[PDB]
């Protein structure tokens, strides 16, 4: 990135605001993040499409809980040759805590990590 | 000494068996509720108390059901949010690991976190 050049997806404002929202653990900060990122001129194919329904809105308390929706997210594979052991282990621990799935990717895994801590 | 209490209860049960045999029945279930097997006698013609125990000898006819409990197990109750939690934090009960859950609570859900 250079200020004179093109635009990019991940840049300073959005990254700092995402790290702040994730570190302080406050939702309105994360909505500020999403509001910033969903306002740039179109950059990908999925920026031109638009949602449009014909039914009437329903309250927030009626939709699925966060549990059954979070179990639909996984983490892609990132080898241990690239990442550091600490970050790999951190991802593996975080993704198992909420009930979702993680990934070990290529490069094998530590046998000694095969038992719950 | 415990044998003392055991002998007490044994004698107390044998007396009931003797009485039920003398009456003509073969089980306590046959006599429960049968109020019409009781009569009221007076102390005599010299005390002059007008006690009438009929208010407790009146017999209300049951109908179709029997005169005692006829169901096994406790009376069940509806199921709260806890069930879902037990269905979600299974690794805690099988694997032995930490968990973290997030739901939406409503005032129509009682005793959240007791079954767990």
| Count of separate DSSP helical elements of chain A | 4
Shape, per Cα inertia axes of chain A: extended
The Cα radius of gyration of chain A reads 19 Å
Largest sheet of chain A: none
Which H/E pattern describes the elements of chain A? Answer: HHHH
* Class from helix and strand fractions of chain A: mainly alpha
Helix residue percentage of chain A: 25-40%
Oligomeric state, counting identical vs distinct chains:
part of a larger assembly
Strand content of chain A: under 5%
Q: Largest interface, and how many residues on either side? A: A-B, 10 and 14 residues
Number of strands of chain A: 0
Q: How far apart are the termini of chain A?
A: 42 Å
PDB class: flavoprotein
Keywords: glutamate synthesys, complex, oligomeric assemblies, flavoprotein
Entry title: Structure of Azospirillum brasilense Glutamate Synthase in a6b6 oligomeric state.
Chains A, B: Glutamate synthase [NADPH] large chain
Key phrases:
36% helix; part of a larger assembly; glutamate synthesys; 117 residues; mainly alpha; Glutamate synthase [NADPH] large chain (chain A); flavoprotein; 2 chains
List the helices and strands and how they pair.
This is part of a larger assembly, with two copies of chain A.
Chain A: H1 12-24, H2 27-37, H3 66-70, H4 85-97
Helix pairs in contact in A: 1-2
PDB class: flavoprotein
Keywords: glutamate synthesys, complex, oligomeric assemblies, flavoprotein
Entry title: Structure of Azospirillum brasilense Glutamate Synthase in a6b6 oligomeric state.
